[PDB]
Amino acid sequence: LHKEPATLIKAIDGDTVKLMYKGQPMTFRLLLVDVPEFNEKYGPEAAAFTKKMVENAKKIEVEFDKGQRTDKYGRGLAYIYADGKMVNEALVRQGLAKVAYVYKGNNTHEQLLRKAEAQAKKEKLNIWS
Ligand SMILES: Cc1cn([C@H]2C[C@H](OP(=O)(O)O)[C@@H](COP(=O)(O)O)O2)c(=O)[nH]c1=O
Ligand SMILES: [Ca+2]
């Protein structure tokens, strides 16, 4: 896998962000995760977490997997990195997301996230509380 540059356009919610990629605007959906809806418990906090992570970053990178790069809604599907830290993984580690939507061909970082989820659960963090 390889990291490509992008710049924040706008935070959206816990697992979507508007990014400029190769000069075009696009909504990215975070691979391998599911966060509560804004109206559901921990939904606001998930959004606030992702927002801070991406807004504070000096450098946002996008990392496509080996399979589908766009979903049925036209959203990009990627691992997003904020100053070299993976947002997908961070949310899961904080118990602000669950591992989810694991499809074959787009699951390189599955075991990594599951490990983070194992440790979030062990600590009864956020959704595991
Ligand atoms: C994460 C992810 C979601 N999706 C689709 C599945 C869901 O379809 P349905 O809307 O038909 O349920 C939807 C969930 O996204 P949200 O969790 O952002 O709503 O996004 C993909 O197709 N690929 C993926 O890698
Ligand atoms: Ca969601």
Curated annotation (Swiss-Prot):
Active-site feature positions: 29, 37, 75
Gene Ontology molecular function terms on file: endonuclease activity, active with either ribo- or deoxyribonucleic acids and producing 3'-phosphomonoesters; metal ion binding; nucleic acid binding
Residues at which Ca(2+) binds: 15, 34-35
Protein encoded by which gene: nuc
UniProt-recorded name of the protein: Thermonuclease
Catalyzed chemical reaction(s): Endonucleolytic cleavage to nucleoside 3'-phosphates and 3'-phosphooligonucleotide end-products
Family that this chain belongs to: Belongs to the thermonuclease family.
Obligatory cofactor(s): Ca(2+)
EC class: hydrolase
Keyword Secreted appears in the UniProt entry: yes
Parent-protein residues present: 86 to 220 of 228
Subcellular location, principal: secreted
Superkingdom of the source species: Bacteria
Function in brief: Enzyme that catalyzes the hydrolysis of both DNA and RNA at the 5' position of the phosphodiester bond.
